[PDB]
Design a binder for this molecule. Structure first.
Ligand SMILES: Cn1cc(C(=O)NCC2(N)CCCCC2)ccc1=O
Length: 103
């Protein structure tokens, strides 16, 4: 669980980050056209928080894959110069920068 002790740190930092607003809650496909069709496996921070609190993550590698899935989805659905896309890149860089510090 010394792997998952840093996960709580990095998730709450991503939760409180300025550019996290597109990823705090799951996308509502009733509100975003095409999202159901485009994104097969949606992911967001609150779903990751949910899962981490019940301890569903067995290793820190599973936690990183959920993080990378938030940004892979973001880059698949949103243009790089979109508001959501621009935020996704800041969040993605922040996650990689922060993850590379514990490992
Ligand atoms: C992860 N992600 C988030 C969004 C997003 O949040 N757009 C703004 C919104 N919060 C307010 C007005 C429309 C509904 C949602 C869009 C595409 C995406 O891939």
């Amino acid at each position: 669980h010394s792997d998952l002790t840093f996960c709580e740190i990095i998730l709450m930092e991503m939760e409180s980050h300025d550019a996290a607003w597109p990823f705090l809650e799951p996308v509502n496909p009733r509100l975003v056209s095409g999202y159901r069709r485009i994104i097969k496996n949606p992911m967001d921070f609150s779903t990751m928080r949910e899962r981490l609190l019940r301890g569903g993550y067995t290793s820190s590698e599973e936690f990183a894959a959920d993080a990378l899935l938030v940004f892979d989805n973001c880059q698949t659905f949103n243009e790089d110069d979109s508001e959501v896309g621009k935020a996704g890149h800041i969040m993605r860089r922040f996650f990689e920068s922060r993850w590379e510090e514990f490992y």
